Write a protein that binds this ligand. Structure first.
Ligand SMILES: CC(C)(Oc1c(Cl)c(Cl)c(Cl)c(Cl)c1Cl)C(=O)O
Length: 134
C-alpha cells in the first residue's frame, strides 16, 4: 500500500525531447512517428490494492495497462508492438522494461518537484517527456 501515492492522478504532457529519435531506435515507422509525435496525452495513474493502472488518453492512441509490481504482463504499445513488460519500483522510480523480438527498452517514471518525468531509453538513445498535473 501507498507505494505509488505521489504518482496517482491525471497528468498532461508539457514537453518532449528527442522523442523522434527514440521512436526511430525502437523501430517505429515514419507515419506513426509523425502522428505520435504531435500527441499531447494525458497519463492517468490509479491504484486499487496491489493493482496499478496507467492509462494514456490521446489523440493518437488510447492505451491502458494494469499490473502488479514485479509480475510480467502482455502489453500492446501505442505503436502496435506486442511486448512482454515488467514494472518494478526501484528507489521510488517506476521502472518499466519491455521485451519483444529480442529487443528491450526501458521507461522510467519519477516524481520531480511538481512534475512527473518520463525517460525512455533504447540502447544509446534517450527521450525525456515531462508531465504536469492536469
Ligand atoms: C513515451 C511514453 C512513455 O509512451 C509512448 C507514447 Cl505516449 C507513444 Cl504515442 C508512443 Cl508511439 C510510444 Cl513508442 C511511447 Cl513509448 C509516454 O507515455 O509519454
Amino acid at each position: 500500500s501507498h507505494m505509488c501515492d505521489a504518482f496517482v492522478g491525471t497528468w498532461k504532457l508539457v514537453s518532449s525531447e528527442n522523442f523522434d529519435d527514440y521512436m526511430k531506435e525502437v523501430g517505429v515507422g515514419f507515419a506513426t512517428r509523425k502522428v505520435a509525435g504531435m500527441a499531447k496525452p494525458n497519463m492517468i495513474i490509479s491504484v486499487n490494492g496491489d493493482v496499478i493502472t496507467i492509462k494514456s488518453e490521446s489523440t493518437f492512441k488510447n492505451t491502458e495497462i494494469s499490473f502488479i509490481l514485479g509480475q510480467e504482463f502482455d502489453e500492446v504499445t501505442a505503436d502496435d508492438r506486442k511486448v512482454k513488460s515488467t514494472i518494478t519500483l526501484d528507489g521510488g522510480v517506476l521502472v518499466h522494461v519491455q521485451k519483444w523480438d529480442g529487443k528491450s527498452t526501458t521507461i522510467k517514471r519519477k516524481r520531480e518537484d511538481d512534475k512527473l518525468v518520463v525517460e525512455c531509453v533504447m540502447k544509446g538513445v534517450t527521450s525525456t517527456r515531462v508531465y504536469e498535473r492536469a
